[PDB]
Design a protein around this ligand. Structure first.
Ligand SMILES: Nc1nc2c(ncn2[C@@H]2O[C@H](COP(=O)(O)OP(=O)(O)O)[C@@H](O)[C@H]2O)c(=O)[nH]1
Ligand code: NA
Length: 307
């Protein structure tokens, strides 16, 4: 009856890098919008919809690390941004904080989406410490601005990438790991919408957990064999890349997908992992999907808010 329209918007260089790598990976039923001052980068964007902002301000260059330029470029193009969003039920705005375009334009894009009624989720990075204190300070101002403009915000400090690489891991492979946070969040919501689960969750449940909330965690875990439900739930709530951990979550959207062997006992085990890890009484919105194609595998999806 209702088919929710999801859009992913990349703002500035890193945000548009994320959009390009996600399109390359493959994502059906999601629409991508690339927003940048940098016309050279936009010409290389794989996104179906591209918006060059601030051409008269920047003559087609980036914003040169000045967030005021990004902010003015986005406001001067509000109509174009609204046209690109129109029809969206949910908008993911992804951006690297600390530069000129993302820091200044991403909060404007999010505000536009929110006042179009879209469930608006920000997924943003903080700069590496080696990029210096000014960049960290600019980024912090952009994070605060994003928080004021979105329904829910996921922050990925780039410094956490240094916790998951070895000395040889290519930087592009590290960036793909940060990409997965957004990509797997979008996909879990897309999967939730597409299927009528045995205990069904739908977009209105996503809205209940994410609307007007603040910090969020999105995660997915997949496991097989003995103890699969516990292991998958631990993976879903344990990202080394997130600023916001599960601890102190008070609302959780949790979906469990399994084959016909999905037992009541292990659904409780998985739910209990999330309750006990949050260390709070969690308002859980719980769903289950029996996908008989799956054999021994189980999938746990978690969206946590209420901090
Ligand atoms: N994780 C990740 N971070 C990025 C990427 N590109 C840029 N960044 C970070 O994002 C910050 C802003 O850079 P960028 O998006 O290119 O600046 P902007 O285009 O002016 O908004 C940089 O300081 C880096 O910390 C990326 O592809 N992945
Ligand atoms: Na569903």
């Amino acid at each position: 009856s209702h088919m929710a329209t999801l859009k992913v918007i990349g703002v500035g260089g890193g945000g548009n890098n994320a959009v390009n790598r996600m399109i390359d990976h493959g994502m059906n039923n999601v629409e991508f919008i690339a927003i940048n001052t940098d016309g050279q980068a936009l010409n290389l964007s794989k996104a179906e919809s591209k918006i060059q902002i601030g051409e008269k301000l920047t003559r087609g260059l980036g914003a040169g690390a000045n967030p005021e330029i990004g902010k003015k470029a986005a406001e001067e193009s509000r109509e174009q941004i609204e046209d690109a969003i129109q029809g969206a039920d949910m908008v993911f705005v992804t951006s690297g904080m600390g530069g000129g375009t993302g820091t200044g334009a991403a909060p404007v894009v999010a505000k536009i989406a929110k006042e179009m009624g879209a469930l608006t989720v920000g997924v943003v990075t903080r700069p590496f410490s080696f990029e210096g204190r000014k960049r960290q300070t600019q980024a912090a101002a952009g994070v605060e601005a994003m928080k004021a403009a979105v329904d829910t915000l996921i922050v990925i400090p780039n410094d956490r990438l240094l916790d998951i690489v070895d000395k040889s891991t290519p930087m592009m492979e590290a960036f793909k790991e940060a990409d997965n946070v957004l990509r797997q969040g979008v996909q879990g919501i897309s999967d939730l919408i597409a299927v009528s689960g045995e205990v069904n969750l739908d977009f209105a449940d996503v809205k209940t957990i994410m609307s007007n909330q603040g910090s969020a965690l999105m995660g997915i875990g997949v496991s097989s064999g003995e103890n699969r439900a516990v292991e998958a739930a631990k993976k879903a709530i344990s990202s080394p890349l997130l600023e916001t951990s599960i601890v102190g979550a008070q609302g959780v959207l949790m979906n469990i997908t399994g084959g016909e062997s999905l037992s009541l006992f292990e659904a409780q085990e998985a739910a209990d992992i999330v309750q006990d890890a949050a260390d709070e009484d969690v308002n859980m919105i719980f769903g289950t999907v029996i996908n008989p194609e799956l054999q021994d595998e189980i999938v746990v999806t978690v969206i946590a808010t209420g901090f």
